[PDB]
Amino acid sequence: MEQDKILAHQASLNTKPSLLPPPVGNPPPVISYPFQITLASLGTEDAADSVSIASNSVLATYTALYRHAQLKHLKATIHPTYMAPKYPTSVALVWVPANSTATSTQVLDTYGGLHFCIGGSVNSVKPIDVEANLTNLNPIIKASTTFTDTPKLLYYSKAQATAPTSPTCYLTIQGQIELSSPLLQASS
Amino acid sequence: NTKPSLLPPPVGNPPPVISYPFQITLASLGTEDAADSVSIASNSVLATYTALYRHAQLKHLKATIHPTYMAPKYPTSVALVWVPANSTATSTQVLDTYGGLHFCIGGSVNSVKPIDVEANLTNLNPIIKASTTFTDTPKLLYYSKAQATAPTSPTCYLTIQGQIELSSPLLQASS
Amino acid sequence: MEQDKILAHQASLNTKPSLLPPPVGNPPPVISYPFQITLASLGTEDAADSVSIASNSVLATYTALYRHAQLKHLKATIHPTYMAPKYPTSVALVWVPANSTATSTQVLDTYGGLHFCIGGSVNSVKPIDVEANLTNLNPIIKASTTFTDTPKLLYYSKAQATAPTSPTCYLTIQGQIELSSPLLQASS
Amino acid sequence: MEQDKILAHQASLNTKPSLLPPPVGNPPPVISYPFQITLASLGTEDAADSVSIASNSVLATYTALYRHAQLKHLKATIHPTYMAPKYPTSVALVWVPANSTATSTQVLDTYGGLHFCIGGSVNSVKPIDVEANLTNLNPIIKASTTFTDTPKLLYYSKAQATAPTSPTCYLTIQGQIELSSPLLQASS
Amino acid sequence: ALYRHAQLKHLKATIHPTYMAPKYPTSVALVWVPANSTATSTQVLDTYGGLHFCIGGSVNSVKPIDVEANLTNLNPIIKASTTFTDTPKLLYYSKAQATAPTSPTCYLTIQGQIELSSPLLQASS
RNA sequence: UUUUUUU
RNA sequence: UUUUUUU
RNA sequence: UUUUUUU
RNA sequence: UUUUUUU
Numbered sequence: 001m002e003q004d005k006i007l008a009h010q011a012s013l014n015t016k017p018s019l020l021p022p023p024v025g026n027p028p029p030v031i032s033y034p035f036q037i038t039l040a041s042l043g044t045e046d047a048a049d050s051v052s053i054a055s056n057s058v059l060a061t062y063t064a065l066y067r068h069a070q071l072k073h074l075k076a077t078i079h080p081t082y083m084a085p086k087y088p089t090s091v092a093l094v095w096v097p098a099n100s101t102a103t104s105t106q107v108l109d110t111y112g113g114l115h116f117c118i119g120g121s122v123n124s125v126k127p128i129d130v131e132a133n134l135t136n137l138n139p140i141i142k143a144s145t146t147f148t149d150t151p152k153l154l155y156y157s158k159a160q161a162t163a164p165t166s167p168t169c170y171l172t173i174q175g176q177i178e179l180s181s182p183l184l185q186a187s188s
Numbered sequence: 189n190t191k192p193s194l195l196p197p198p199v200g201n202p203p204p205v206i207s208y209p210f211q212i213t214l215a216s217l218g219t220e221d222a223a224d225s226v227s228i229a230s231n232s233v234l235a236t237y238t239a240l241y242r243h244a245q246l247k248h249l250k251a252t253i254h255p256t257y258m259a260p261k262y263p264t265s266v267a268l269v270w271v272p273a274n275s276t277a278t279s280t281q282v283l284d285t286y287g288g289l290h291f292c293i294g295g296s297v298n299s300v301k302p303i304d305v306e307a308n309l310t311n312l313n314p315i316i317k318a319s320t321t322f323t324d325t326p327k328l329l330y331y332s333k334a335q336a337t338a339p340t341s342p343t344c345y346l347t348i349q350g351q352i353e354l355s356s357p358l359l360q361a362s363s
Numbered sequence: 364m365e366q367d368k369i370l371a372h373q374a375s376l377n378t379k380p381s382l383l384p385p386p387v388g389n390p391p392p393v394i395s396y397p398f399q400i401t402l403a404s405l406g407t408e409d410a411a412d413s414v415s416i417a418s419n420s421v422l423a424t425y426t427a428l429y430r431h432a433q434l435k436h437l438k439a440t441i442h443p444t445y446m447a448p449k450y451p452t453s454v455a456l457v458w459v460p461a462n463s464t465a466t467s468t469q470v471l472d473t474y475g476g477l478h479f480c481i482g483g484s485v486n487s488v489k490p491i492d493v494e495a496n497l498t499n500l501n502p503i504i505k506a507s508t509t510f511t512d513t514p515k516l517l518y519y520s521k522a523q524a525t526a527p528t529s530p531t532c533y534l535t536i537q538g539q540i541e542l543s544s545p546l547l548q549a550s551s
Numbered sequence: 552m553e554q555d556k557i558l559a560h561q562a563s564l565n566t567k568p569s570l571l572p573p574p575v576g577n578p579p580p581v582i583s584y585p586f587q588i589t590l591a592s593l594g595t596e597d598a599a600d601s602v603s604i605a606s607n608s609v610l611a612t613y614t615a616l617y618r619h620a621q622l623k624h625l626k627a628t629i630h631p632t633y634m635a636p637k638y639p640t641s642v643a644l645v646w647v648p649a650n651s652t653a654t655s656t657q658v659l660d661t662y663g664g665l666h667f668c669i670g671g672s673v674n675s676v677k678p679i680d681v682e683a684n685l686t687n688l689n690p691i692i693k694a695s696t697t698f699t700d701t702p703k704l705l706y707y708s709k710a711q712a713t714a715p716t717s718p719t720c721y722l723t724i725q726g727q728i729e730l731s732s733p734l735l736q737a738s739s
Numbered sequence: 740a741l742y743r744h745a746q747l748k749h750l751k752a753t754i755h756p757t758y759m760a761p762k763y764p765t766s767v768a769l770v771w772v773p774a775n776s777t778a779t780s781t782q783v784l785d786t787y788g789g790l791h792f793c794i795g796g797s798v799n800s801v802k803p804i805d806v807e808a809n810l811t812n813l814n815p816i817i818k819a820s821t822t823f824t825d826t827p828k829l830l831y832y833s834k835a836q837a838t839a840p841t842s843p844t845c846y847l848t849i850q851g852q853i854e855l856s857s858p859l860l861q862a863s864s
Numbered sequence: 865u866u867u868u869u870u871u
Numbered sequence: 872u873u874u875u876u877u878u
Numbered sequence: 879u880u881u882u883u884u885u
Numbered sequence: 886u887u888u889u890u891u892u
Contacts, residue, residue, distance in 0.1 A: 014546055016430075018383075018506050019508065126368060131373070143509070143511075145508055
């Protein structure tokens with residue numbers, strides 16, 4: 001009962017993959033820094049964008065001094081303004097890993113995508129919070145290694161045809177970022 | 189300082205894992221000389237299966253040479269070796285690489301049985317998709333020399349087969 | 364007693380980040396190899412460059428054979444020549460992580476940056492060393508992935524208006540690199 | 552801390568899916584019947600086909616008298632003939648569930664696909680068996696219910712340009728089928 | 740600016756010579772004193788720890804000259820809930836050649852490490 | 865096969 | 872609210 | 879909501 | 886071989 005296959009063996013050796021060795025040399029001191037950044041003023045014209053938290057100019061002014069930066073908490077917030085009652089505005093948003101191929105115009109076609117109606121007399125003008133789940137999305141936005149699954153926020157907003165001249169709401173992100181390992185930069 | 193980067197602790201239950209099988213024909217050999225290098229992690233076919241997930245790891249992986257009805261009359265040489273993708277060895281240096289194999293397919297007795305060459309996934313990085321990009325994933329180098337007066341049909345086929353473990357859905361749109 | 368905010372929940376699922384599986388078997392042996400590489404001949408004309416240690420052609424001839432390379436010690440040295448005393452040369456240098464945005468003209472605005480006067484009369488003594496602090500720079504220049512903060516050397520040099528035809532000094536780097544896990548290469 | 556969603560409930564009732572109730576009325580007698588069917592005579596011209604075991608005319612002459620038919624064992628066999636030594640022939644085949652979209656020309660692009668070289672002086676003219684895995688493929692080719700994953704055999708064969716006039720090999724399938732539950736048919 | 744508490748861990752002044760120092764020797768004198776000291780730049784040598792150097796001229800091109808600040812004689816806390824009177828103050832005096840160069844003969848810098856804590860709310864604009 | 869990796 | 876301070 | 883399924 | 890009989 002012979003088999004119809006010949007097995008050829010490629011000689012092996014002891015060679016393995018590797019990353020970063022352990023700290024055991026005094027785990028570096030970590031500081032936590034708070035932030036609130038206004039990403040957009042909506043309601044005067046349609047708008048749509050994708051914000052990669054790890055590439056954000058403003059947040060980068062804090063992480064530029066360190067080699068490691070990890071989000072402790074993160075959320076987006078929509079704050080209705082004095083123009084929301086008379087000019088209802090649509091705002092849709094969803095949080096996805098940065099390597100997702102989803103675009104701002106496909107929020108409702110993405111699992112978890114939300115769409116809100118801001119303003120409208122009968123409506124409520126209470127602000128809305130949408131937390132980013134840092135157990136699904138990778139919170140390490142800066143490290144020795146480059147990660148591809150950090151938080152990316154997608155948002156779309158539709159304004160009234162006959163729009164106001166002042167925004168109906170502000171979209172901001174807020175959280176705290178753990179910083180460590182000074183990265184030598186110039187002071188000039 | 190000295191704080192490069194590791195991961196935060198797995199919160200709860202680890203995500204479910206599924207295995208998807210595959211077999212791909214890389215080349216039809218014996219009608220003309222051939223030589224190529226195939227980086228598994230960059231393969232178009234595999235990419236369609238991993239596109240929906242965040243983590244993809246090879247479970248088993250091997251190359252197989254399948255002699256055809258033209259091998260008996262047209263002996264063909266096939267050489268191949270598995271190396272990490274960052275190796276700079278080229279397809280024409282298989283026998284100058286530790287573990288490189290060169291086979292004679294057809295013409296002589298017993299030379300028409302198919303041949304398997306497993307990739308050692310403890311010597312090559314099996315993770316082809318994760319939170320970061322790796323540089324040492326499997327790369328197959330192959331070289332083939334055909335008879336001067338070659339046939340019009342291939343003397344053998346080179347395929348690779350295995351299974352990929354997929355996990356952690358990557359949010360995408362339905363559109 | 365009533366809060367002024369609305370919480371919206373983005374539907375979640377079990378999806379986590381990931382890297383390398385646990386290390387299986389015996390770890391491979393490590394060896395340290397000493398080296399000294401000449402990076403530049405200075406003094407015949409103004410010069411300024413930035414050298415990324417991880418992508419240096421010469422050092423790569425040592426790391427080409429392995430998968431993991433880690434610096435144990437690393438320093439830069441300025442060796443003066445017999446032409447330095449007649450043609451004093453300014454040489455300034457600093458070590459920074461590769462992802463630092465500092466430039467050769469900002470050495471003195473960067474921690475650890477030094478500006479020297481080579482020759483002129485003096486500064487012919489036991490060549491000047493400028494050690495790299497491996498706790499502020501990632502010493503691993505080769506592994507399963509590429510790192511962003513490996514050593515980068517910045518240097519700036521000003522030569523005399525009426526310059527010599529032979530260099531007034533040489534800039535080299537010296538150190539020891541730990542190598543492990545052979546990488547299959549051809550022996551041709 | 553109010554939520555931004557209203558939950559509406561659709562009234563339910565006790566309604567469930569269902570199939571076939573248990574036997575408890577005397578499990579029907581089962582008989583096992585053997586078969587060997589020649590599917591093709593290869594080597595005189597290229598050939599390619601897909602054979603759905605549940606639709607096979609010949610096997611159906613046995614199952615036509617019953618309501619339930621289940622394969623106990625099943626395999627394909629290639630038997631080289633007196634013309635194989637001088638006329639090497641290629642035969643490729645693979646077993647897949649009937650609902651697979653794979654076609655006869657894609658055997659080697661399907662997990663498990665095999666390709667053999669039959670004949671050739673230096674070769675062997677020993678017959679070859681390729682068992683169908685009845686734990687992966689659904690063995691019930693006939694029942695009260697129609698199943699979509701029963702065994703389907705795909706095969707491709709390439710013959711010599713200057714071919715023989717008699718086949719170089721025969722492809723057959725053989726096994727045993729468990730039959731039960733007489734299905735009333737006419738005897739005329 | 741981003742924090743409420745700042746304390747110096749190490750602090751020093753350094754004089755880095757340039758290629759012009761050897762042809763144009765420069766006198767440089769410096770001393771560290773608490774901010775509430777009444778000493779002036781012309782009294783460096785009459786103050787404890789004050790040093791007067793000759794930069795270039797031929798020599799003094801070696802590994803830049805450091806002058807460490809003693810944090811037990813100077814208050815290292817430069818930022819807290821209140822303002823302090825004795826934080827570090829650096830005094831320096833320099834005499835150049837009568838016929839001076841058009842490029843500097845040396846640079847004076849300060850280097851150190853500062854301990855920061857208690858974030859201070861600032862705008863991110 | 866140009867077999868000494870998986871402790 | 873743009874909620875992770877009061878051990 | 880036009881809530882009486884998940885024993 | 887087209888191997889599932891000899892409990």
